[PDB]
Design an enzyme around this catalytic site. Sequence first.
Site, PDB file in Angstrom:
ATOM      1  N   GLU A 138       9.765  36.329  19.986  1.00 38.15           N
ATOM      2  CA  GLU A 138      10.107  36.708  18.613  1.00 38.15           C
ATOM      3  C   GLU A 138       9.271  37.953  18.282  1.00 38.15           C
ATOM      4  O   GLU A 138       8.088  37.981  18.595  1.00 38.15           O
ATOM      5  CB  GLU A 138       9.748  35.562  17.674  1.00 38.15           C
ATOM      6  CG  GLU A 138      10.146  35.776  16.210  1.00 38.15           C
ATOM      7  CD  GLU A 138       9.729  34.610  15.326  1.00 38.15           C
ATOM      8  OE1 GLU A 138       8.727  33.916  15.648  1.00 38.15           O
ATOM      9  OE2 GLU A 138      10.415  34.364  14.317  1.00 38.15           O
ATOM     10  N   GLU A 240      10.870  38.460   4.789  1.00 40.00           N
ATOM     11  CA  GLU A 240      10.457  37.066   4.933  1.00 40.00           C
ATOM     12  C   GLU A 240       9.463  36.743   3.820  1.00 40.00           C
ATOM     13  O   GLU A 240       8.491  37.466   3.644  1.00 40.00           O
ATOM     14  CB  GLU A 240       9.833  36.797   6.308  1.00 40.00           C
ATOM     15  CG  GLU A 240       9.391  35.345   6.499  1.00 40.00           C
ATOM     16  CD  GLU A 240       9.036  34.975   7.937  1.00 40.00           C
ATOM     17  OE1 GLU A 240       9.075  35.854   8.826  1.00 40.00           O
ATOM     18  OE2 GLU A 240       8.721  33.780   8.178  1.00 40.00           O
TER      19      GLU A 240
END
Length: 271
Positions: A138, A240
């Site tokens: 990621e 986020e």
Amino acid sequence: VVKPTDERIIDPSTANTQLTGGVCYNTTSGGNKPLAGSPYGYETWIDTGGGVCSLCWYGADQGGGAAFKATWTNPHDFLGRLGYFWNENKPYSHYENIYCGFNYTRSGRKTAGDYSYIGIYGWSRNPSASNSNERLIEYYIVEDWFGNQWQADTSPMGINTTGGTVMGSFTVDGSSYQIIKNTRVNQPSIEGDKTFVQYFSIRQSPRKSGTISITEHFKKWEKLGMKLGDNMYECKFLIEAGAGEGFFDARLIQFYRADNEGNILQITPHH
């Protein structure tokens, strides 16, 4: 590598006209969802145990084609993202030199919980890696964040937020970036609950507009032994928010790709 001068590239510094007419998504998308008349896809992760969140795409014909607004009201780790979806068994180098021009407004300090991220995000797969922990990756290129109670949003986050180890640093696009590698042990992923690695580039001088030379990060990670492998999943602009009540509102998100001569391979979108 020659920086592209193609006149279809929108100057991010002055791309600050408020956009209207979004198409909004208020629930978890369940992966990538393609956008009509666009090369891009969006994804939302909206925990139904949290408050109201949305991502609104501004369409194919304004704001560089990947512009969106997102809102969150006491989420539990809201992620809204939009950009390239790949997942076609190709390493990053296949896509040549990737750039993203951006310009947004956002809510202020302490409006997104204890941790938050704004910038570029994706995953990559490296099944042939000898270390099984490193077969799924990621990744984040962090241009900005909302700080928290303890740290100003004008101060770059570090390993106290991300976890892991500072591997090195370099300078690109007007700032030093600190490079961090973190291992996520038996955590949720695109492949189910497992151990995988995270790569971060943290912009030392946070900003709300400019150009991200994305491929430069990929090259520097790989030089530090932080390999991406040969199946890039996506490359998207992300907001986020761990918690809090806030917004993110892009006037510009423009992805483009060019070869080393600086010629356009892909860009979006008479007098």
